[PDB]
Amino acid sequence: VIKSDMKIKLRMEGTVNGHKFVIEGEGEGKPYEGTQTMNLKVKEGAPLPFAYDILTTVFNRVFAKYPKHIPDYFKQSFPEGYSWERSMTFEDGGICTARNDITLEGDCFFNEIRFDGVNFPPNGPVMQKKTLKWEPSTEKMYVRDGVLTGDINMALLLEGGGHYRCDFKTTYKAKKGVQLPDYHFVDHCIEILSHDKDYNNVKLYEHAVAHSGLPRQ
């Protein structure tokens, strides 16, 4: 049911330090190549008073290239689909919770997202919009207590060229039982390709590739 080319529709409702917003997205991706692009529009709550980058990794691991030797939990989840939940703990104490329930209808993934962020300091890089991009990252995928889990040590590049660190923990749950993978990794690169002044319109891109660990030789 997952074709070489697929469409994507998304709705996020969220709050950051109490500021409510809604963002809608429409995009397309190549699940077997691990690439996807989305156009995102702020529907309610503009202008967003915080760094848009905190939202972008919340805007589907179906879009990750899996080699034959690693079970692909995500593609096997369909047609029923899966959901994930995530915590994001930034090093200055800003904390976010997020969830996405992902379904498939025809050739289009639907993503129903909730995002909430708290305790971002008023003069920190998130509330002052001082971020530039996420550095490329490697997600560690493992099974704990029967739950597929990804851990990432993420870093946002800041104005000035320093970094602002974030610990991600994501739990992934297929809607029916799926063959679980062994310990593995997924490399990611995410980029805002373009945006308008206050990020009311954003074009976003991600590439992701699963792999094993470094060999002995």
Q: Left if phi > 0, otherwise alpha if psi is -120 to 50, otherwise beta: which for 58?
A: alpha
Provide the token pair at 126.
Answer: 């998130």
Asked if residue 128 binds a second copy (CB under 8 A), the reply is no
Helix extents (H) in the chain: 53-56, 73-76
* 208 binding a second copy? (CB under 8 A): yes
Tell me if 22 contacts a second copy by CB under 8 A. Answer: no
Nearer to a second copy, 41 or 99 (CB): 99
Q: Does 157 help bind a second copy (rule: CB under 8 A)? A: yes
| DSSP 8-state secondary structure symbol assigned to residue 65 | B
Instruction: Point out which span in 1-9, 22-30, 48-56, 158-166 binds a second copy (CB under 8 A).
Output: 158-166
| DSSP calls for 116-163 | EEE---TTSTTTTT-EEEEPPEEEEEEEETTEEEEEEEEEEEETTS-E
Which residue(s) pair with 41 in the sheet?
24, 201
CB of 216 to a second copy, least distance (A): 6
Reference 86, options 55, 126, 65, 109; nearest CA is: 55
Which amino acid belongs to residue 200? N
Query: Using CB under 8 A, which of 104, 180, 189, 192 touches a second copy?
Result: 189
Which of residues 3, 97, 176, 198 is near a second copy by CB under 8 A?
97
Positive or negative: CA dihedral 59, 63, 65, 67: positive
State which amino acid sits at residue 48: L
Q: How far is the CB of 24 from a second copy (least distance, A)?
A: 20
> Is residue 37 at the binding interface for a second copy, with CB under 8 A as the rule?
no
Binding flag, residue 70, a second copy (CB under 8 A): no
Residues that bind a second copy (CB under 8 A): 15, 17-18, 83, 85-87, 89, 93, 95-99, 101, 114, 116-119, 121-124, 135-138, 140, 142, 144-147, 151-153, 155, 157, 162-163, 165, 169, 171, 183, 185, 187-189, 191, 205, 207-209, 212-217
